[PDB]
Amino acid sequence: RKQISVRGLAGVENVTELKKNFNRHLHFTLVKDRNVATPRDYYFALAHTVRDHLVGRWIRTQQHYYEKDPKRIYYLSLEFYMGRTLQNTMVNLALENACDEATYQLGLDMEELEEIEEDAGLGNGGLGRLAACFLDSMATLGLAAYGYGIRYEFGIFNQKICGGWQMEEADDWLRYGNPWEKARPEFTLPVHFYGRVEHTSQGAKWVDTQVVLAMPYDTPVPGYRNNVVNTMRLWSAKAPQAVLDRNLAENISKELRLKQEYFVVAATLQDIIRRFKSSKFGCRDPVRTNFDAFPDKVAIQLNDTHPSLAIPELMRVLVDLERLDWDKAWEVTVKTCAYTNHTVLPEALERWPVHLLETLLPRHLQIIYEINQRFLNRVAAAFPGDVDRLRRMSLVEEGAVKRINMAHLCIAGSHAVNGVARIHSEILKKTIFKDFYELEPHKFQNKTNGITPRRWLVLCNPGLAEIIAERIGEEYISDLDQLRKLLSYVDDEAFIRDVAKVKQENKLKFAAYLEREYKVHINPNSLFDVQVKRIHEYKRQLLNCLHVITLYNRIKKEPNKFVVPRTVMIGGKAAPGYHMAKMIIKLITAIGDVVNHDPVVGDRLRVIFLENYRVSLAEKVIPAADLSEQISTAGTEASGTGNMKFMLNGALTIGTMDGANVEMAEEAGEENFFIFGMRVEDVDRLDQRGYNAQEYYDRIPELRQIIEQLSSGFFSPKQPDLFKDIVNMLMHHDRFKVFADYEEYVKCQERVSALYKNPREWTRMVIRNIATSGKFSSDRTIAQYAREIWGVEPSRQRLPA
Amino acid sequence: RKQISVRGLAGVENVTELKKNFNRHLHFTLVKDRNVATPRDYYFALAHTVRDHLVGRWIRTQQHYYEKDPKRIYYLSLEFYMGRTLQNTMVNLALENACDEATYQLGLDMEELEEIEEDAGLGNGGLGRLAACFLDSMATLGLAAYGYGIRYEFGIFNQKICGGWQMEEADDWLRYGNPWEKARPEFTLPVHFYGRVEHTSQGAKWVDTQVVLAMPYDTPVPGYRNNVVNTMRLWSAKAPQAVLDRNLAENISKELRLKQEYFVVAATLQDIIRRFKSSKFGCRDPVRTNFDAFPDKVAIQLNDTHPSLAIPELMRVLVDLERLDWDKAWEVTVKTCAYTNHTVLPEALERWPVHLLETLLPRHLQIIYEINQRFLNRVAAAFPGDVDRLRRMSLVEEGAVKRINMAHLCIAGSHAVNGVARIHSEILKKTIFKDFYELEPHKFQNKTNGITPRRWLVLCNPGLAEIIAERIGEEYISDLDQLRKLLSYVDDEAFIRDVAKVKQENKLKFAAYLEREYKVHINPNSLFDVQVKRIHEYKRQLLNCLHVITLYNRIKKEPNKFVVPRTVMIGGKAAPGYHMAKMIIKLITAIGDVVNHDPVVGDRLRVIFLENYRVSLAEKVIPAADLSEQISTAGTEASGTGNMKFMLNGALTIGTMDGANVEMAEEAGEENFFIFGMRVEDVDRLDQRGYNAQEYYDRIPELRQIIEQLSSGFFSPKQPDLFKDIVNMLMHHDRFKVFADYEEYVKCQERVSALYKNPREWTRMVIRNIATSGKFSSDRTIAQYAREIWGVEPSRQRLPA
Numbered sequence A, B: 001r002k003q004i005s006v007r008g009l010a011g012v013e014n015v016t017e018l019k020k021n022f023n024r025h026l027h028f029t030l031v032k033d034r035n036v037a038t039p040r041d042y043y044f045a046l047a048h049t050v051r052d053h054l055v056g057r058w059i060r061t062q063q064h065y066y067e068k069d070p071k072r073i074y075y076l077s078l079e080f081y082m083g084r085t086l087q088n089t090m091v092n093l094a095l096e097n098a099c100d101e102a103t104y105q106l107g108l109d110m111e112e113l114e115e116i117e118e119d120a121g122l123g124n125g126g127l128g129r130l131a132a133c134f135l136d137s138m139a140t141l142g143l144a145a146y147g148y149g150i151r152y153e154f155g156i157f158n159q160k161i162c163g164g165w166q167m168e169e170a171d172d173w174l175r176y177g178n179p180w181e182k183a184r185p186e187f188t189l190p191v192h193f194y195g196r197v198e199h200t201s202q203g204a205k206w207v208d209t210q211v212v213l214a215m216p217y218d219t220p221v222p223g224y225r226n227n228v229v230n231t232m233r234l235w236s237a238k239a240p241q242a243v244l245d246r247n248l249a250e251n252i253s254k255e256l257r258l259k260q261e262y263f264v265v266a267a268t269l270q271d272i273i274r275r276f277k278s279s280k281f282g283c284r285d286p287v288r289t290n291f292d293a294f295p296d297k298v299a300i301q302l303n304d305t306h307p308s309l310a311i312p313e314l315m316r317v318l319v320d321l322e323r324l325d326w327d328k329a330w331e332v333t334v335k336t337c338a339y340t341n342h343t344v345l346p347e348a349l350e351r352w353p354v355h356l357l358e359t360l361l362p363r364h365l366q367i368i369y370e371i372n373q374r375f376l377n378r379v380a381a382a383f384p385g386d387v388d389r390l391r392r393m394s395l396v397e398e399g400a401v402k403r404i405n406m407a408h409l410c411i412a413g414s415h416a417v418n419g420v421a422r423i424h425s426e427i428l429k430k431t432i433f434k435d436f437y438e439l440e441p442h443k444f445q446n447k448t449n450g451i452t453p454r455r456w457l458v459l460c461n462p463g464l465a466e467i468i469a470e471r472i473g474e475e476y477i478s479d480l481d482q483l484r485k486l487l488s489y490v491d492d493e494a495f496i497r498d499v500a501k502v503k504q505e506n507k508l509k510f511a512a513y514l515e516r517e518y519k520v521h522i523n524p525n526s527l528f529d530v531q532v533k534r535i536h537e538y539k540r541q542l543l544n545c546l547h548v549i550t551l552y553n554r555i556k557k558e559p560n561k562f563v564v565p566r567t568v569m570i571g572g573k574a575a576p577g578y579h580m581a582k583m584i585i586k587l588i589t590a591i592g593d594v595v596n597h598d599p600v601v602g603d604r605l606r607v608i609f610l611e612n613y614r615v616s617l618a619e620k621v622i623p624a625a626d627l628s629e630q631i632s633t634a635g636t637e638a639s640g641t642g643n644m645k646f647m648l649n650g651a652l653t654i655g656t657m658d659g660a661n662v663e664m665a666e667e668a669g670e671e672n673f674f675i676f677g678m679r680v681e682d683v684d685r686l687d688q689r690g691y692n693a694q695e696y697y698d699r700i701p702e703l704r705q706i707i708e709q710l711s712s713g714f715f716s717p718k719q720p721d722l723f724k725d726i727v728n729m730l731m732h733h734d735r736f737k738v739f740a741d742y743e744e745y746v747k748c749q750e751r752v753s754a755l756y757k758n759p760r761e762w763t764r765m766v767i768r769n770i771a772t773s774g775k776f777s778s779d780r781t782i783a784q785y786a787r788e789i790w791g792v793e794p795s796r797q798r799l800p801a
């Protein structure tokens, strides 16, 4: 040792040693030939070549944290929607061009090579994506953060459309393993389920438990060019008839979800105290032990209630294991945890039945109770005589099924609870958790969501970032508010023509991709109208459907009257066993089989379902979008980060005054936004009076006609009654008010095409939107977390090399 | 491509580079630090540094074989007892010295790191060690050979002696991963079980089968300094309730041994036909479709009957898949396979119930039946009227259970069957397989087993190799006949002095191990008396026990008679489920508890039961051995390669004229050997009169005293009747005649001790054993197979570099 260090091993980001290393990895790391390599072998080689550069920096970063002892942030989440690591590592590390030349010179095309990479199947959505944009911004802001979760071996399915219907296929992303991760067998910890608590004169004892082993995997996450590489640590379940218990064990990768919830917590928290106590540089020993500075050195950001078992667990470790006195343990737990809510919908909260916590984890139920009692006593002091307040506030819900309300726990156990959007965080204070806000207002906060400008602009849209940068430099990639500078070119004929050029190139490129994959020919001069969201009824892909049959039926009625051409691309996954979602994907495809095959349509309309929407494909479709469809019923959407992604990339939005749309439009100015339909005040008035959809049917002929086609097999001649289910629901069981927003939607849509007809004024409104999107960067959300909740100062400073 | 080459990536075999690559591996490969590295890390970083040198040479060897298209030899075995790759690879590659100096300039201790490696748990014992010594000799002799076996997830237990009794602890060697192996997920084959068979128009179809997946792992195996590095391919089982099925597919690692044998047959042969067809350098397509060349391009060595299903499987592949006609498909099979019979006993050979085969392998049974029908027709034509020979030679055995005899399958279907020692190969023709030798006599061959002069000498005994080197060059190491040149030094005092010096220094060091790992203190001047044979009754550790008690009892009786001091070491694993063997290991340790603690015995006799005997332990005790115990009943030992290990390393043999001891005494000259006891003829005489153990006991006084001591609780005070089960066995059901060779055995021991008193004559007898050991090199054995069975001429030529 001593003479063993990173000392100068990666060499240079220079094309000659970068080609050496590609060959070194093809032959010695993959034990492969030129005679036996395939595209994948060649991708792993390039992946391992960039990975040496990333790992050298990771090591100099982690070390640096132990030397300086920063406050460590553990961001705890049950999904992280990472996507593909290679180009993001190369972009973030300024390696993408030397790798491009190196690869050219060995006779390979990095574009083809990057596409053999599988998306890390570690998340299914917005929650997980937020956590992933947060990991990029925490590293670019130089914070010492960690993302801890579960390493799902087969994530949630990969979608395949067959016969226009959805199929789910196993997401076997780890089939040939994953180069970005290092498995750490030597740090497997054990987790305890079941057991019984015997008490002693000394403490509570959780005896006779079944043990699952939690094995760690590490993957670095690069900050953008600041030489900071931080850590993602994902836990894998391993078994230590026994056949059956072993399988149940491995299933962590109903009760299984409470298991994996405890698993990621128990295991992560052992690491948090392990690294706490063993504070010194060089020294692997416990050195620290007074937990008084523990709030000063550890932050646990609970992403949603899914890891709320961290609060009963941290009290249990400190009180039983470390034998601290309960009031101090709690002093330290509230000063350490914080909770992030993501919903407007009370019904949606996480409530685990006590009969199950009784079985799976007796000790934690005991601590949820001494928390609850000591809580309700404080509310009691503060609002004496208010018996129903005790009732509403109680962590334990009651009657019918006896339940623990994990949100109430998270608010009791944390020193900051925040919503994700201005109106949303108001709803938390005012109606959702009003009694927690009257008891303790100081903890409620708002941290509006953001997206990372690296993955969502300089990576996926090099062209746009390239034309912006020549005018205002590159300081905006770490300070997105500098995009307000582009307003100085809303009249520059050269910047207008360029902004427009970038989008036509991006559309041509996307058309090329769909052509070679799904083999469709779409017209790159049409308006690309994109709706990509989880296929769900409040998302109202069905309003978008009624609109494309309005367009088809319209071209048909006057086939020689001009129309701006559109390509309507809808994409997204349907929950297996959500029947209406399944029916909607099948309608989109049925509509499209008619539309795209009609020759009187010519090249004026095409409805295309984008299969297997995932982070990789969003990176293709959003740089090519001309219109963002953000049409969910007012009041159902708390945020909308995809929304912000489309605005960053030059599409214009058509949507409801809701979620992300409201702060996007105050930033953009509402005259640069196609806001339509009923606001929240209007849906509630309609709810006060009862929606009766027959009134819309009765007074709107074009809608009456569309339902008439749906009931007669126009879009399913081979099986006429197929769509009866959506027809009856739209007519009689439509909670999301589709008919009530149609007329307005089509009128707004007409305005969209009118603007599209005059390319200089569309491009000028698109400049007004790009220039005001600077607010929606996740670096701004993370500098607000850092300062208002975690109590650390973001740094834009470079670490050495 | 083309620029994508192995072209000089390895670099120099010098200390500076070796250290660069070490630092590089600990950092980028293992992602670790001086700050968190353990021994186990510094060992994986040196194993990874060396491995780069091994893989480059492997790539250029396998390219060399596709470019020359030679006859590829597949040594199919179910167990490969490889031991430990690191120093064997350093030695074979000449890296050893540079890796020592490099590790010193990095302040590490290469011998501490070498002691971290686990023994590769892929072999039970003897037959797999033979498999491993041969991999090395095929590589050293330039043969394009492959070793194909199973990749056991946890090898057979690591033995643990708790309080004299034996424990089977988990040999979970694979925990931290093995740096030598590379998993190939991309090359996973199906293996089918169960099913039914249709006979269609075009042929036969084995349908509705359970499919298990064979995924291979590749390990390089290097020849001694010739630059030929060859492949070891072991199949791993993956399942594609499938909890049950998944467990049992993973359980391949009763019906499970047949599933397990068929697994490694099926997978391996898929590769064989693959690599035959895909013959042309640079072209992966099946070029070669004409099976006429198959027997000149593939050889398959069926080691024991454990892969006998390679014969019904090749037929199935050629008749059913490749569609050859039976008669030509047979012609090809027999010319490709060869059987090696390792037994001597008729009831050790495999027989499988035909109920079990019709259910598990219905197609293979159909083929085993048509092979038998035609075989039994060949013998009917050659011996007309001989109906009991048709009964006798049939592969299908009748009587209560219809069984298939797999050794008849192997004779019928292989072009060559051989034994591993001259006597045993004669025995196969006279008794076991006489009818078969009568029908097709040309098949029967002998190939005497051998050991490898690299591991068993330049590797485990660098001092003996040093002093032989300086008198006769480095050539003996791969031409061991050159050791007879040492007979010229039989009268040379400085050689006599350095040979006895090497043994002394070797004993001195092993003494240090039995302290620093076992607490008993052995005396470096006692003759190290070693018996390490699998603990079994025919092996007669019990005779040795009767002679260690005789020495004890003699010393006690006259504590002032000079005795030569002896350290008696007995080692071997007892099969779980064999009581008598676990009683023998408990008897050994009992005598030790006594002998080693008796003050009148003083340091004159010490008994040590060496726990968890394996190849790395063997590598340490055989270099320090003075006398080699080879005492099993004449007629129970077919060969015995451990015997040869001892001869090369300076021990003399006390042994029966049986197994490897016959040809050893023959090369060394009977005078230089302590052969005692009965011969085969004498024990058969004794069996016709009746062995009556009592006769010996009644006439032998000291024996009477010993059995008295064992019944009386003398060696077991607290449990007096502990050893009465082996007493009744010795006395009344001794099947391997202990008491019948007891007095000649003890007689011969006095001759060993007497000689041991005159060191100049002992070292001269040792020079006469060592100089004659040359015959017993596995290089000789493989050159015999290559030349007489596989049809290849060994090449001792170096490949480039």
Ligand SMILES: Nc1ncnc2c1ncn2[C@@H]1O[C@H](COP(=O)(O)O)[C@@H](O)[C@H]1O
Pocket (backbone or CB within 6 Å): A059, A060, A062, A063, A066, A067, A275, A278, A279, A280, A281, A282, A283, A284, B031, B032, B033, B035, B036
């Ligand atoms: N006590 C320590 N002093 C210095 N560096 C350390 C120490 N512990 C761990 N490291 C560094 O942090 C990385 C990850 O460590 P850990 O945070 O302990 O999982 C290691 O590879 C080292 O780079």
Ligand SMILES: Nc1ncnc2c1ncn2[C@@H]1O[C@H](COP(=O)(O)O)[C@@H](O)[C@H]1O
Pocket (backbone or CB within 6 Å): A031, A032, A033, A035, A036, B058, B059, B060, B062, B063, B066, B067, B275, B278, B279, B280, B281, B282, B283, B284
């Ligand atoms: N057709 C081929 N031509 C030349 N080299 C090959 C070919 N197939 C395989 N190889 C080499 O042989 C090694 C083992 O391949 P295989 O025998 O296919 O398992 C590969 O790593 C290559 O180095």
Ligand SMILES: *Cc1c(COP(=O)(O)OP(=O)(O)O)cnc(C)c1O
Pocket (backbone or CB within 6 Å): A124, A125, A126, A127, A129, A532, A533, A534, A613, A614, A615, A618, A639, A640, A641, A642, A643, A645
């Ligand atoms: C951007 C992103 C998202 C998150 O965006 P959403 O607008 O769709 O929010 P939700 O519908 O509320 O979850 C989800 N999935 C991917 C692939 C992605 O890039």
Ligand SMILES: *Cc1c(COP(=O)(O)OP(=O)(O)O)cnc(C)c1O
Pocket (backbone or CB within 6 Å): B125, B126, B127, B129, B532, B533, B613, B614, B615, B618, B639, B640, B641, B642, B643, B645
């Ligand atoms: C040397 C060796 C062996 C071989 O010993 P044996 O020759 O006595 O076995 P048999 O061939 O059956 O007589 C077995 N196991 C290990 C550890 C070893 O190194």
